[PDB]
Amino acid sequence: SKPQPIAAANWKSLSELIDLFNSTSINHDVQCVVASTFVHLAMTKERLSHPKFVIAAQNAGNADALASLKDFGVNWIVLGHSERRWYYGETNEIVADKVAAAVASGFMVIACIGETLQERESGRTAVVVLTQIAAIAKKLKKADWAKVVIAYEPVWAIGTGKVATPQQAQEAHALIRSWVSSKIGADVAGELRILYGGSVNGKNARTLYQQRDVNGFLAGLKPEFVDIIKATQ
């Protein structure tokens, strides 16, 4: 069966959304995550009180900063998110190094991978996406995967007017899981959460989650996130 799902919201009225979250009865087993840019961390940390949620940081790559976050009570982090790669110039290896540093500093890591429109249209989804995860794997030991969560972002269907179908999502999640099974271990593959990080809402979240290899979502910090959480059964 599927491992514990994750519903994660990635920051990019915050108070009003937090209250909404706090007031939400979540009846099933799902780890919820609110990922914040540094300036919003303190307020989110103090306002978010739902015990099925954890706070996550984003993009920290310095060991002292990681230690300070941990000391501050932040135990999750999101790394490799699309714009970090296509805009900020974080390479496969930079993201991998950040993932490894975070794991070593005691973080649960949501590590993001995904191909662009140009890459997808050149037929290079697999080589691009698997090369990204391969770089991450290179800096990890097998035991570390207990602290890793993968998020697949269809960058090609983000801001391009292109639209991903649940089958296209499943296809991508499946080829990732197959790579993990073969290169890391079928035991690791079976427990690994692979989250969908493309367009999601209350209309299609439930449909996406029904896919065999989808274990939750990395979505926007928005009111409909409540529906995304509920979609994880």
Side-chain angles (χ1 to χ4, degrees), residues 176-206:
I176 293 164
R177 203 174 304 275
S178 177
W179 181 94
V180 178
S181 186
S182 309
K183 299 290 185 294
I184 311 304
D187 53 345
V188 172
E191 300 302 312
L192 171 67
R193 275 76 71 84
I194 311 184
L195 316 182
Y196 180 66
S199 277
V200 185
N201 55 210
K203 310 92 205 303
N204 69 352
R206 194 158 268 112

PDB file of all heavy atoms in Angstrom, residues 176-206:
ATOM      1  N   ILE A 176      10.196   7.833 -11.977  1.00  0.00           N
ATOM      2  CA  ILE A 176      11.007   8.169 -10.815  1.00  0.00           C
ATOM      3  C   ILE A 176      11.048   6.992  -9.860  1.00  0.00           C
ATOM      4  O   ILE A 176      12.116   6.608  -9.392  1.00  0.00           O
ATOM      5  CB  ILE A 176      10.470   9.395 -10.042  1.00  0.00           C
ATOM      6  CG1 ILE A 176      10.603  10.658 -10.883  1.00  0.00           C
ATOM      7  CG2 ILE A 176      11.233   9.577  -8.708  1.00  0.00           C
ATOM      8  CD1 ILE A 176       9.762  11.816 -10.381  1.00  0.00           C
ATOM      9  N   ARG A 177       9.889   6.420  -9.557  1.00  0.00           N
ATOM     10  CA  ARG A 177       9.894   5.314  -8.599  1.00  0.00           C
ATOM     11  C   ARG A 177      10.676   4.122  -9.153  1.00  0.00           C
ATOM     12  O   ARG A 177      11.416   3.448  -8.431  1.00  0.00           O
ATOM     13  CB  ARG A 177       8.489   4.896  -8.170  1.00  0.00           C
ATOM     14  CG  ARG A 177       8.522   4.173  -6.805  1.00  0.00           C
ATOM     15  CD  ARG A 177       7.167   3.852  -6.261  1.00  0.00           C
ATOM     16  NE  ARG A 177       6.312   5.026  -6.144  1.00  0.00           N
ATOM     17  CZ  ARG A 177       6.300   5.861  -5.110  1.00  0.00           C
ATOM     18  NH1 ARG A 177       7.104   5.666  -4.066  1.00  0.00           N
ATOM     19  NH2 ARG A 177       5.454   6.876  -5.114  1.00  0.00           N
ATOM     20  N   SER A 178      10.527   3.875 -10.447  1.00  0.00           N
ATOM     21  CA  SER A 178      11.278   2.785 -11.069  1.00  0.00           C
ATOM     22  C   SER A 178      12.791   3.002 -10.976  1.00  0.00           C
ATOM     23  O   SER A 178      13.553   2.061 -10.769  1.00  0.00           O
ATOM     24  CB  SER A 178      10.851   2.599 -12.528  1.00  0.00           C
ATOM     25  OG  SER A 178      11.637   1.588 -13.148  1.00  0.00           O
ATOM     26  N   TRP A 179      13.237   4.242 -11.134  1.00  0.00           N
ATOM     27  CA  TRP A 179      14.654   4.525 -11.014  1.00  0.00           C
ATOM     28  C   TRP A 179      15.078   4.276  -9.566  1.00  0.00           C
ATOM     29  O   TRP A 179      16.131   3.689  -9.318  1.00  0.00           O
ATOM     30  CB  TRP A 179      14.972   5.969 -11.425  1.00  0.00           C
ATOM     31  CG  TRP A 179      16.444   6.314 -11.349  1.00  0.00           C
ATOM     32  CD1 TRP A 179      17.361   6.247 -12.360  1.00  0.00           C
ATOM     33  CD2 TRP A 179      17.156   6.777 -10.193  1.00  0.00           C
ATOM     34  NE1 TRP A 179      18.598   6.642 -11.904  1.00  0.00           N
ATOM     35  CE2 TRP A 179      18.498   6.967 -10.576  1.00  0.00           C
ATOM     36  CE3 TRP A 179      16.785   7.053  -8.871  1.00  0.00           C
ATOM     37  CZ2 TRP A 179      19.473   7.417  -9.683  1.00  0.00           C
ATOM     38  CZ3 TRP A 179      17.758   7.494  -7.983  1.00  0.00           C
ATOM     39  CH2 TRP A 179      19.082   7.672  -8.396  1.00  0.00           C
ATOM     40  N   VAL A 180      14.258   4.718  -8.613  1.00  0.00           N
ATOM     41  CA  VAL A 180      14.609   4.540  -7.205  1.00  0.00           C
ATOM     42  C   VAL A 180      14.677   3.051  -6.869  1.00  0.00           C
ATOM     43  O   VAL A 180      15.587   2.586  -6.169  1.00  0.00           O
ATOM     44  CB  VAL A 180      13.605   5.230  -6.262  1.00  0.00           C
ATOM     45  CG1 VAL A 180      13.987   4.964  -4.821  1.00  0.00           C
ATOM     46  CG2 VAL A 180      13.567   6.728  -6.523  1.00  0.00           C
ATOM     47  N   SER A 181      13.715   2.297  -7.379  1.00  0.00           N
ATOM     48  CA  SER A 181      13.694   0.870  -7.102  1.00  0.00           C
ATOM     49  C   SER A 181      14.977   0.192  -7.587  1.00  0.00           C
ATOM     50  O   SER A 181      15.561  -0.615  -6.873  1.00  0.00           O
ATOM     51  CB  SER A 181      12.479   0.203  -7.741  1.00  0.00           C
ATOM     52  OG  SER A 181      12.412  -1.159  -7.330  1.00  0.00           O
ATOM     53  N   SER A 182      15.415   0.538  -8.794  1.00  0.00           N
ATOM     54  CA  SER A 182      16.545  -0.142  -9.428  1.00  0.00           C
ATOM     55  C   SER A 182      17.882   0.322  -8.881  1.00  0.00           C
ATOM     56  O   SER A 182      18.793  -0.480  -8.699  1.00  0.00           O
ATOM     57  CB  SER A 182      16.520   0.081 -10.944  1.00  0.00           C
ATOM     58  OG  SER A 182      15.246  -0.224 -11.482  1.00  0.00           O
ATOM     59  N   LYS A 183      18.003   1.620  -8.625  1.00  0.00           N
ATOM     60  CA  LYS A 183      19.288   2.209  -8.263  1.00  0.00           C
ATOM     61  C   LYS A 183      19.512   2.273  -6.754  1.00  0.00           C
ATOM     62  O   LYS A 183      20.656   2.241  -6.291  1.00  0.00           O
ATOM     63  CB  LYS A 183      19.430   3.616  -8.858  1.00  0.00           C
ATOM     64  CG  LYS A 183      19.375   3.690 -10.381  1.00  0.00           C
ATOM     65  CD  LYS A 183      20.614   3.074 -11.013  1.00  0.00           C
ATOM     66  CE  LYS A 183      20.617   3.246 -12.528  1.00  0.00           C
ATOM     67  NZ  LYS A 183      19.519   2.475 -13.177  1.00  0.00           N
ATOM     68  N   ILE A 184      18.430   2.399  -5.989  1.00  0.00           N
ATOM     69  CA  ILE A 184      18.573   2.579  -4.544  1.00  0.00           C
ATOM     70  C   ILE A 184      18.104   1.340  -3.785  1.00  0.00           C
ATOM     71  O   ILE A 184      18.782   0.865  -2.866  1.00  0.00           O
ATOM     72  CB  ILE A 184      17.792   3.822  -4.025  1.00  0.00           C
ATOM     73  CG1 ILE A 184      18.102   5.065  -4.868  1.00  0.00           C
ATOM     74  CG2 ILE A 184      18.064   4.050  -2.535  1.00  0.00           C
ATOM     75  CD1 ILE A 184      19.585   5.427  -4.966  1.00  0.00           C
ATOM     76  N   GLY A 185      16.938   0.834  -4.167  1.00  0.00           N
ATOM     77  CA  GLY A 185      16.355  -0.346  -3.557  1.00  0.00           C
ATOM     78  C   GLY A 185      14.836  -0.326  -3.632  1.00  0.00           C
ATOM     79  O   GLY A 185      14.205   0.733  -3.496  1.00  0.00           O
ATOM     80  N   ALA A 186      14.238  -1.497  -3.839  1.00  0.00           N
ATOM     81  CA  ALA A 186      12.782  -1.609  -3.870  1.00  0.00           C
ATOM     82  C   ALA A 186      12.173  -1.293  -2.510  1.00  0.00           C
ATOM     83  O   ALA A 186      11.008  -0.874  -2.417  1.00  0.00           O
ATOM     84  CB  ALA A 186      12.357  -3.004  -4.329  1.00  0.00           C
ATOM     85  N   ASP A 187      12.947  -1.510  -1.449  1.00  0.00           N
ATOM     86  CA  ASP A 187      12.462  -1.176  -0.114  1.00  0.00           C
ATOM     87  C   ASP A 187      12.349   0.341   0.026  1.00  0.00           C
ATOM     88  O   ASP A 187      11.340   0.860   0.493  1.00  0.00           O
ATOM     89  CB  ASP A 187      13.332  -1.793   1.002  1.00  0.00           C
ATOM     90  CG  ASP A 187      14.818  -1.475   0.859  1.00  0.00           C
ATOM     91  OD1 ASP A 187      15.258  -1.034  -0.223  1.00  0.00           O
ATOM     92  OD2 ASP A 187      15.563  -1.690   1.847  1.00  0.00           O
ATOM     93  N   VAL A 188      13.388   1.042  -0.404  1.00  0.00           N
ATOM     94  CA  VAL A 188      13.372   2.501  -0.412  1.00  0.00           C
ATOM     95  C   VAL A 188      12.260   3.045  -1.306  1.00  0.00           C
ATOM     96  O   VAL A 188      11.519   3.948  -0.905  1.00  0.00           O
ATOM     97  CB  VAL A 188      14.730   3.064  -0.840  1.00  0.00           C
ATOM     98  CG1 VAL A 188      14.636   4.579  -1.044  1.00  0.00           C
ATOM     99  CG2 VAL A 188      15.788   2.718   0.216  1.00  0.00           C
ATOM    100  N   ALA A 189      12.133   2.478  -2.508  1.00  0.00           N
ATOM    101  CA  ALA A 189      11.090   2.894  -3.444  1.00  0.00           C
ATOM    102  C   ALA A 189       9.695   2.796  -2.840  1.00  0.00           C
ATOM    103  O   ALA A 189       8.866   3.690  -3.006  1.00  0.00           O
ATOM    104  CB  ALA A 189      11.164   2.068  -4.726  1.00  0.00           C
ATOM    105  N   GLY A 190       9.433   1.699  -2.138  1.00  0.00           N
ATOM    106  CA  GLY A 190       8.112   1.457  -1.589  1.00  0.00           C
ATOM    107  C   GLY A 190       7.704   2.447  -0.514  1.00  0.00           C
ATOM    108  O   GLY A 190       6.531   2.743  -0.357  1.00  0.00           O
ATOM    109  N   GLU A 191       8.681   2.965   0.219  1.00  0.00           N
ATOM    110  CA  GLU A 191       8.397   3.876   1.327  1.00  0.00           C
ATOM    111  C   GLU A 191       8.485   5.344   0.917  1.00  0.00           C
ATOM    112  O   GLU A 191       8.033   6.215   1.645  1.00  0.00           O
ATOM    113  CB  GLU A 191       9.365   3.625   2.488  1.00  0.00           C
ATOM    114  CG  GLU A 191       9.318   2.213   3.067  1.00  0.00           C
ATOM    115  CD  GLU A 191       7.940   1.846   3.579  1.00  0.00           C
ATOM    116  OE1 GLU A 191       7.345   2.660   4.315  1.00  0.00           O
ATOM    117  OE2 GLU A 191       7.443   0.750   3.228  1.00  0.00           O
ATOM    118  N   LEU A 192       9.080   5.611  -0.242  1.00  0.00           N
ATOM    119  CA  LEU A 192       9.363   6.985  -0.650  1.00  0.00           C
ATOM    120  C   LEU A 192       8.084   7.731  -1.025  1.00  0.00           C
ATOM    121  O   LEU A 192       7.267   7.231  -1.798  1.00  0.00           O
ATOM    122  CB  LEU A 192      10.355   6.985  -1.823  1.00  0.00           C
ATOM    123  CG  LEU A 192      10.637   8.305  -2.556  1.00  0.00           C
ATOM    124  CD1 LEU A 192      11.367   9.319  -1.670  1.00  0.00           C
ATOM    125  CD2 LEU A 192      11.455   8.025  -3.807  1.00  0.00           C
ATOM    126  N   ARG A 193       7.899   8.921  -0.465  1.00  0.00           N
ATOM    127  CA  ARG A 193       6.808   9.775  -0.901  1.00  0.00           C
ATOM    128  C   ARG A 193       7.232  10.559  -2.135  1.00  0.00           C
ATOM    129  O   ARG A 193       8.250  11.245  -2.113  1.00  0.00           O
ATOM    130  CB  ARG A 193       6.391  10.755   0.204  1.00  0.00           C
ATOM    131  CG  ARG A 193       5.404  10.186   1.204  1.00  0.00           C
ATOM    132  CD  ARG A 193       6.085   9.253   2.184  1.00  0.00           C
ATOM    133  NE  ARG A 193       6.948   9.961   3.133  1.00  0.00           N
ATOM    134  CZ  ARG A 193       6.530  10.539   4.257  1.00  0.00           C
ATOM    135  NH1 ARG A 193       5.251  10.523   4.589  1.00  0.00           N
ATOM    136  NH2 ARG A 193       7.400  11.133   5.057  1.00  0.00           N
ATOM    137  N   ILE A 194       6.449  10.450  -3.210  1.00  0.00           N
ATOM    138  CA  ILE A 194       6.652  11.282  -4.396  1.00  0.00           C
ATOM    139  C   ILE A 194       5.445  12.185  -4.571  1.00  0.00           C
ATOM    140  O   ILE A 194       4.347  11.720  -4.861  1.00  0.00           O
ATOM    141  CB  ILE A 194       6.841  10.451  -5.679  1.00  0.00           C
ATOM    142  CG1 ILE A 194       7.890   9.362  -5.454  1.00  0.00           C
ATOM    143  CG2 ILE A 194       7.231  11.369  -6.850  1.00  0.00           C
ATOM    144  CD1 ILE A 194       8.201   8.562  -6.717  1.00  0.00           C
ATOM    145  N   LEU A 195       5.648  13.486  -4.387  1.00  0.00           N
ATOM    146  CA  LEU A 195       4.551  14.425  -4.430  1.00  0.00           C
ATOM    147  C   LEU A 195       4.428  15.079  -5.789  1.00  0.00           C
ATOM    148  O   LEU A 195       5.424  15.377  -6.444  1.00  0.00           O
ATOM    149  CB  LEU A 195       4.781  15.533  -3.411  1.00  0.00           C
ATOM    150  CG  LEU A 195       5.267  15.039  -2.052  1.00  0.00           C
ATOM    151  CD1 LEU A 195       5.425  16.216  -1.042  1.00  0.00           C
ATOM    152  CD2 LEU A 195       4.311  13.985  -1.522  1.00  0.00           C
ATOM    153  N   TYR A 196       3.201  15.354  -6.188  1.00  0.00           N
ATOM    154  CA  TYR A 196       2.985  16.079  -7.429  1.00  0.00           C
ATOM    155  C   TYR A 196       3.052  17.576  -7.146  1.00  0.00           C
ATOM    156  O   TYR A 196       2.360  18.066  -6.255  1.00  0.00           O
ATOM    157  CB  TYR A 196       1.625  15.723  -8.010  1.00  0.00           C
ATOM    158  CG  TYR A 196       1.346  16.439  -9.298  1.00  0.00           C
ATOM    159  CD1 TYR A 196       2.106  16.175 -10.424  1.00  0.00           C
ATOM    160  CD2 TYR A 196       0.325  17.381  -9.393  1.00  0.00           C
ATOM    161  CE1 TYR A 196       1.861  16.820 -11.615  1.00  0.00           C
ATOM    162  CE2 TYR A 196       0.071  18.036 -10.588  1.00  0.00           C
ATOM    163  CZ  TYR A 196       0.848  17.744 -11.696  1.00  0.00           C
ATOM    164  OH  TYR A 196       0.614  18.383 -12.899  1.00  0.00           O
ATOM    165  N   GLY A 197       3.891  18.283  -7.898  1.00  0.00           N
ATOM    166  CA  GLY A 197       4.093  19.714  -7.730  1.00  0.00           C
ATOM    167  C   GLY A 197       3.616  20.608  -8.870  1.00  0.00           C
ATOM    168  O   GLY A 197       4.090  21.730  -9.024  1.00  0.00           O
ATOM    169  N   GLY A 198       2.666  20.134  -9.663  1.00  0.00           N
ATOM    170  CA  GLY A 198       2.091  20.958 -10.716  1.00  0.00           C
ATOM    171  C   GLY A 198       0.754  21.552 -10.308  1.00  0.00           C
ATOM    172  O   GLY A 198       0.404  21.552  -9.124  1.00  0.00           O
ATOM    173  N   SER A 199       0.001  22.045 -11.290  1.00  0.00           N
ATOM    174  CA  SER A 199      -1.315  22.637 -11.043  1.00  0.00           C
ATOM    175  C   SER A 199      -2.232  21.679 -10.321  1.00  0.00           C
ATOM    176  O   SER A 199      -2.472  20.556 -10.787  1.00  0.00           O
ATOM    177  CB  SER A 199      -1.974  23.068 -12.358  1.00  0.00           C
ATOM    178  OG  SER A 199      -1.518  24.347 -12.769  1.00  0.00           O
ATOM    179  N   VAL A 200      -2.745  22.109  -9.176  1.00  0.00           N
ATOM    180  CA  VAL A 200      -3.680  21.276  -8.433  1.00  0.00           C
ATOM    181  C   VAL A 200      -4.754  22.108  -7.759  1.00  0.00           C
ATOM    182  O   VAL A 200      -4.483  23.196  -7.251  1.00  0.00           O
ATOM    183  CB  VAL A 200      -2.976  20.445  -7.354  1.00  0.00           C
ATOM    184  CG1 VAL A 200      -3.966  19.502  -6.702  1.00  0.00           C
ATOM    185  CG2 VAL A 200      -1.826  19.665  -7.947  1.00  0.00           C
ATOM    186  N   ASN A 201      -5.971  21.573  -7.747  1.00  0.00           N
ATOM    187  CA  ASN A 201      -7.080  22.181  -7.028  1.00  0.00           C
ATOM    188  C   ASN A 201      -8.062  21.113  -6.560  1.00  0.00           C
ATOM    189  O   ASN A 201      -7.824  19.917  -6.747  1.00  0.00           O
ATOM    190  CB  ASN A 201      -7.783  23.216  -7.902  1.00  0.00           C
ATOM    191  CG  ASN A 201      -8.244  22.641  -9.225  1.00  0.00           C
ATOM    192  OD1 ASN A 201      -8.310  23.346 -10.230  1.00  0.00           O
ATOM    193  ND2 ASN A 201      -8.563  21.356  -9.234  1.00  0.00           N
ATOM    194  N   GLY A 202      -9.167  21.545  -5.961  1.00  0.00           N
ATOM    195  CA  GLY A 202     -10.165  20.628  -5.445  1.00  0.00           C
ATOM    196  C   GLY A 202     -10.824  19.769  -6.510  1.00  0.00           C
ATOM    197  O   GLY A 202     -11.376  18.705  -6.214  1.00  0.00           O
ATOM    198  N   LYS A 203     -10.769  20.221  -7.757  1.00  0.00           N
ATOM    199  CA  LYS A 203     -11.404  19.490  -8.843  1.00  0.00           C
ATOM    200  C   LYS A 203     -10.562  18.298  -9.294  1.00  0.00           C
ATOM    201  O   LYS A 203     -11.108  17.262  -9.683  1.00  0.00           O
ATOM    202  CB  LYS A 203     -11.693  20.417 -10.030  1.00  0.00           C
ATOM    203  CG  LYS A 203     -12.427  21.706  -9.654  1.00  0.00           C
ATOM    204  CD  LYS A 203     -11.439  22.835  -9.359  1.00  0.00           C
ATOM    205  CE  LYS A 203     -12.028  23.889  -8.431  1.00  0.00           C
ATOM    206  NZ  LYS A 203     -13.292  24.476  -8.959  1.00  0.00           N
ATOM    207  N   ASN A 204      -9.239  18.438  -9.248  1.00  0.00           N
ATOM    208  CA  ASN A 204      -8.371  17.397  -9.799  1.00  0.00           C
ATOM    209  C   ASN A 204      -7.409  16.752  -8.805  1.00  0.00           C
ATOM    210  O   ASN A 204      -6.802  15.722  -9.104  1.00  0.00           O
ATOM    211  CB  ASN A 204      -7.613  17.907 -11.029  1.00  0.00           C
ATOM    212  CG  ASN A 204      -6.584  18.955 -10.686  1.00  0.00           C
ATOM    213  OD1 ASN A 204      -6.516  19.436  -9.552  1.00  0.00           O
ATOM    214  ND2 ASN A 204      -5.764  19.316 -11.669  1.00  0.00           N
ATOM    215  N   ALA A 205      -7.281  17.350  -7.626  1.00  0.00           N
ATOM    216  CA  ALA A 205      -6.407  16.804  -6.586  1.00  0.00           C
ATOM    217  C   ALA A 205      -6.777  15.359  -6.271  1.00  0.00           C
ATOM    218  O   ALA A 205      -5.924  14.465  -6.289  1.00  0.00           O
ATOM    219  CB  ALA A 205      -6.471  17.661  -5.334  1.00  0.00           C
ATOM    220  N   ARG A 206      -8.060  15.113  -6.021  1.00  0.00           N
ATOM    221  CA  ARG A 206      -8.486  13.760  -5.690  1.00  0.00           C
ATOM    222  C   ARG A 206      -8.179  12.789  -6.826  1.00  0.00           C
ATOM    223  O   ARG A 206      -7.747  11.659  -6.592  1.00  0.00           O
ATOM    224  CB  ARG A 206      -9.968  13.714  -5.305  1.00  0.00           C
ATOM    225  CG  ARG A 206     -10.370  12.399  -4.633  1.00  0.00           C
ATOM    226  CD  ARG A 206     -11.633  12.539  -3.781  1.00  0.00           C
ATOM    227  NE  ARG A 206     -11.346  12.859  -2.380  1.00  0.00           N
ATOM    228  CZ  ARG A 206     -11.637  14.021  -1.797  1.00  0.00           C
ATOM    229  NH1 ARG A 206     -12.225  14.993  -2.490  1.00  0.00           N
ATOM    230  NH2 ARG A 206     -11.344  14.212  -0.517  1.00  0.00           N
TER     231      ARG A 206
END
